[PDB]
Amino acid sequence: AQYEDGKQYTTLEKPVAGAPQVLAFFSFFCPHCYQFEEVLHISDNVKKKLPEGVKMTAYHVNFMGGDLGKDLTQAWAVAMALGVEDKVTVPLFEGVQKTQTIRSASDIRDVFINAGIKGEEYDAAWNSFVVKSLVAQQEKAAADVQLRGVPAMFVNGKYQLNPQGMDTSNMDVFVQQYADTVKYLSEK
């Protein structure tokens, strides 16, 4: 078949009940995640092909970067709570990997301030139990899919994308294959 278990995707041996329909995991420290988001625009291209009523969810992971990695998971929870993911994704990726100006929790906060989030609003969110819950939710989801590495993407809590089984001849064809595989899986 054109789509094959073991080729473009794999099947979780322990499917996750109640998982977001399309769930991506990433780290702002992950070089492949930087390529996926800033050069290939994987997330945007997946979203443009999702069936009606299917949304993408993206969660950060703790296992890269020690202390700062966990600060970034908490800041990503702030971005999700405030609805500012689209304002901070590029400067967080660039701050960590391009300019390497993000070295502390305060430096993360500066990205939000420069993006127009008010200081009091950031600090209230950072310290909130809503954000504590969103950190726990990102951690629980990674545990539930037995996450090993990033980037990763999971569909319906049952299928894991396998980019290494896709055609990497051309970067844009690869992005197309990835997005079309997510759509195929969301309809399975």
Residue numbers in the entry: 1 to 188
What does the paper say about this structure?
DsbA from E. coli K−12 (EcDsbA) was the first and is probably the best-characterised DSB enzyme to date. This 21 kDa periplasmic protein is a dithiol oxidase that catalyses disulphide bond formation between consecutive cysteines of unfolded polypeptides as they are translocated to the periplasm. EcDsbA consists of a canonical TRX domain, a hallmark of proteins involved in redox homeostasis, with an inserted helical domain. The TRX domain harbours the conserved active site CXXC (C30-P31-H32-C33 in EcDsbA) that is featured in many proteins of the TRX superfamily. The acidity of this groove originates from a cluster of negatively charged residues (E24, E37, E38, D44, E85, D86 and E94) that map along a buried channel in the interface between the TRX and helical domains of EcDsbA.
DsbA K58A and double-mutant E24A/K58A were crystalised in space group C2, with two molecules per asymmetric unit. In comparison, overlay of chain A of wildtype DsbA and chain A of the E24A/K58A mutant showed the smallest difference, with an RMSD of 0.34 Å over 174 Cα atoms. The crystal structures of the three mutants containing the K58A mutation showed that the shorter alanine side chain at position 58 significantly expanded the size of the entrance to the buried channel. In all three crystal structures, a glycerol molecule, used for cryoprotection, was modelled into the electron density. The binding of glycerol displaced w2 in all three structures and hindered precise analysis of the water network in these mutants. When E37 was present in the protein structures, water w3 was observed to form a hydrogen bond with E37 in both K58A and E24A/K58A structures. However, the double-mutant E24A/K58A yielded a rate constant of 1.47 ± 0.06 × 106 M−1 s −1, 35% slower than that of wildtype EcDsbA. Mutation of two or more of the E24, E37 and K58 further increased the “disordered” solvent content, reducing the structured hydrogen bond network between the charged residues and the w1–w4 water molecules. Indeed, both E24A/K58A and E24A/E37A/K58A mutants displayed significantly lower thiol oxidase activity compared to the wildtype protein (although the more reducing redox potential of the latter would also affect its oxidase activity). While native DsbA rapidly oxidised the substrate peptide (in less than 10 s), in the case of the DsbA double E24A/K58A and triple E24A/E37A/K58A mutants, oxidised DsbA was present in the reaction for over 10 and 20 s, respectively.
